[PDB]
Amino acid sequence: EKFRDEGRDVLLFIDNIYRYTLAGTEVSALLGRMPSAVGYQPTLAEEMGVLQERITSTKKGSITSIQAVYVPADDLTDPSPATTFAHLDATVVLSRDIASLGIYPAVDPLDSTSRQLDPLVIGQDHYDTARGVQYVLQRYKELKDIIAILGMDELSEADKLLVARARKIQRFLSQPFFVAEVFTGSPGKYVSLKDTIAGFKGILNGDYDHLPEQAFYMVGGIEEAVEKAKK
Amino acid sequence: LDPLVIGQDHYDTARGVQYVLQRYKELKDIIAILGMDELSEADKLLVARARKIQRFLSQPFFVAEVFTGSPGKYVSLKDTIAGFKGILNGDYDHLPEQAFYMVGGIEEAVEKAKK
Amino acid sequence: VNAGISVSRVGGAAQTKIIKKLSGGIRTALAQYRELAAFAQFASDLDEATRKQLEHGQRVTELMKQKQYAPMS
Amino acid sequence: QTGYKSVDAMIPVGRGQRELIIGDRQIGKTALAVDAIINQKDSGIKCVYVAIGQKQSTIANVVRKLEENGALANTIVVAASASESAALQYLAPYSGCTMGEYFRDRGEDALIVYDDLSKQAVAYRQISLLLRRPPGREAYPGDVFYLHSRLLERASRVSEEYVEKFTNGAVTGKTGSLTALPIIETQAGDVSAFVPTNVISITDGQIFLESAMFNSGIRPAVNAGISVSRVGGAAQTKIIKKLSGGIRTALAQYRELAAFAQFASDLDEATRKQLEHGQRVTELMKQKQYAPMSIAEMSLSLYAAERGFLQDVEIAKVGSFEQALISYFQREHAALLAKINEKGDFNDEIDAGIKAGIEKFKATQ
Amino acid sequence: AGAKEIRSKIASIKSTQKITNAMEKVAVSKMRKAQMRMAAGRPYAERIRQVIGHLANANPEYRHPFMVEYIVVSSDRGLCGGLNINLFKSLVKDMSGYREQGAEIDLCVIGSKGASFFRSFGGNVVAAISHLGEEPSINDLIGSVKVMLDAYLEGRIDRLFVVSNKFVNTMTQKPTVEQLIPLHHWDYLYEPDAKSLLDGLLVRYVESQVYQAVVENNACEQAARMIAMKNATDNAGELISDLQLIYNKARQAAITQEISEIVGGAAAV
Amino acid sequence: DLELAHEKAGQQLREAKAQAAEIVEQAKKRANQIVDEARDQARTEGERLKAQ
Amino acid sequence: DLELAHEKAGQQLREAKAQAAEIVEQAKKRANQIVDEARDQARTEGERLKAQ
């Protein structure tokens, strides 16, 4: 809150929001209060609201928060997950499968979501580009089961062309971070929103269909894929 | 139940019976949906021995004659080991499933199959 | 009356000589027939022993049926 | 090292780590922890076994087994049996921890086993409800998480500066540690119960034992698909870290393609090759009680499977092949096993040396 | 009743789903085997058509009855995606046109489901065979075919048609009916006689088109089974997903009840 | 070639008997190793037991 | 004769391998006796010392 008052945009990382809920359950039991549904504290929604309502964009600065979430017994209807999800604007899912492929960021483009993915907020251009990438990535996941069960020859010309764009899209979702130079052996990159939208828009339209997919791996902006290709 | 306390022959027979019954606990639902025909030959052959071993575990007791109606039987561990080993080997695969129900020793089972 | 779950802890001692001999293992035989029917629902032709047991089971099951206010000596 | 190929290769435990042994009743939880203590008799790690709520004759069979295997002289046994006061059962883990902390604070290494943290929680619940403290979920007091967390955060690795500060300079250059192997019993596989949920969240990793695997002849019963060590490869010697990578891929492939076992003929050749490899690596993980394996002896078995030396061995003879291979190397290659056992090191000469011995074994034994 | 029963049902459905997953891939492999056995019979059919054609043209004085003015194929196993029904629905449609026109109809049944459809409706038959291997041989069809060829020769049948599904694609099995009976510059040397040879060639050609039909229907059976086992796997997941929601409700409800009982007893003692 | 083949076969026939006998020679060394280590194990159990 | 030249090597190798296995099983049998006989001798002296 102090830095926000200074005139800054701040990041607040909470190691685990489920442990904040459990600490409230433990304190409520120690004070002798009557327990609620599934054994949680009667103050569950108020204790979450008191914390989450301070994290907002004011007229001086803005505190943005990244919170790790744990789901009890894999149940999304349990009071703790239910209450927390009511205050979340975006959901980032990290995938063990994607990591094996070699994409280190490891964010799942199909399971991850945001409430800001609306044309009335980000404009028609950003929205169509993002939904285009998700559409292509969905079709490729279905086609991969076909290629596996029946074979690659069973696909149409349009489907094989889509698979080639989907693979290029999937690798262009990778990026070298300044803190990962020790692992990647390459310098870090900070891509802008403008460069991000322009890069994916071209690959969906087919402007880069002649380039090899590897040229679209760990490069940053789209001009760097074109240069990694000439070589 | 430890080879260092009893012996390897007893232990292997016990673990052998358990292995056959544990595998059959999963094929039971498979047989309910679909049918028996859709199984592989090894599974069809195993299902038969499991159903027989389950029945060969049944023994008429003297204290239960009032309820069973039949005479009680006493089986020595030697007969207990011999019979189950033979069924697991498949020696009695020529006997109908109904012959092992309440038949004390395996010998009796061979006689019940003739009635 | 579910014959598999129902049981008497007095058994044959609570029966007259005629019914005691004639009804020998009928409950345990009905309990096994209910199980055999579910297993053989979608199987290919089975042995004479199996077909015979399945046929005998459907008859005692129909016999145990009785009307209200119509007892038997 | 615990001496188990399934644990030491896929769920490695490091000095100062806290690894939970979790699973239902009567599936080898006690056997895995006692064998982990037996394997330390030559390692340098002092061991502590804490018995909470056990019957007195059971504790005596473990001590008789520690004495028969030569591990008792390196172990402290702390007992609070089922007829003893709930206060003594509640305090026993802290008493055993205090005895283990002596070696850690003085520059040395120790291992502690809490045979039932779930029985310590039950004893603390009795005292609390009798003092009339406000109850929560499953009738436990509000500080049951703090009970186990205060205990388990003591198991740690301390720096050289902490040991030089505590010893007042006497011990220098040495880092001390206390490794913990807490045990918890689940009811019908329900890991979502209150006490299991707390301890799963406190520990660095979990070894899950399963009743279905134990009844299917897979004696160590370790479900490698859900068991995890957050420390990972940092807790492994160079040789086992190199040969465990493919073992992971082969078991993962076996979990995916295991229904096709009855339709293996109709399988595609590549897949049929993967399926038998998965079934041979799965049969390799089976081991016997009171038979801990050394870094060199585990390396022979893992090397033989990972480099393809089992493709001509019937899945039913993989075990006698392993037992005979180790016995061959113990007689004709004693110098190479002694070399690997120094630090678990690996290089082109050790790789070629093991290969030559396995090829010679197949040619005569 | 409670959470205990639902766990057994979710485990029961999860076990069946894994085998139906494999059976889809087994079926795809068998579909590829039946598609190569389809192609290893085209040369014998395309060349005999050319010979039967030219041999008639150079010998106009002989006009075999087959050249001037139902065999039904069904499966031996289940799991098909209504493949037998869809053909049996085209067999009934064509038979109707002839019953309306006034003609009688004799039938040849290949496979188990064909017999079931006729025993269930008291239908007539003149020939029948089943239990043919997933790999059929032309020799088995000779007996059944002969009962039908003689009819057409003895006038016992005016027209003969083969009713089988056709392998349009991996996703399509078109039910169809086609007429088996009735059907350059230089000229051939004939040994022993042209008429002697035409009689032999025509039987080899009809027995060939019947074998072509059986094999193609087996490829259709495998594809149909692949889709059915995919459907069954998906349906199982939907049941697992629905039961899991009920299990979570039962889990949460059990916890609240116990806490009420603990609190209730503590508020008395 | 019949006599030359009989000689070739005569050499391969006998060499396999000598080579097969060497498997029995390894087995005799292994049997001695099992018994010698069993004597040392028995000595170890004897001195371990009497100490209690 | 070229068949007999490998059949009488293959047969004699299976016989030699059976003999090698027999030699090993005889040694395993000899080993457990050497260990448990020493246990009874040691236990007997321990009980004698206790009784005295």
Ligand SMILES: Nc1ncnc2c1ncn2[C@@H]1O[C@H](COP(=O)(O)OP(=O)(O)OP(=O)(O)O)[C@@H](O)[C@H]1O
């Ligand atoms: N290789 C093995 N590893 C583990 N257990 C084995 C093995 N081979 C056989 N067993 C047997 O499995 C049983 C495991 O008993 P153990 O006491 O270790 O189980 P547990 O889960 O700790 O039981 P409990 O919950 O009552 O304490 C013992 O009979 C043991 O001898």
Ligand SMILES: [Mg+2]
């Ligand atoms: Mg125990």
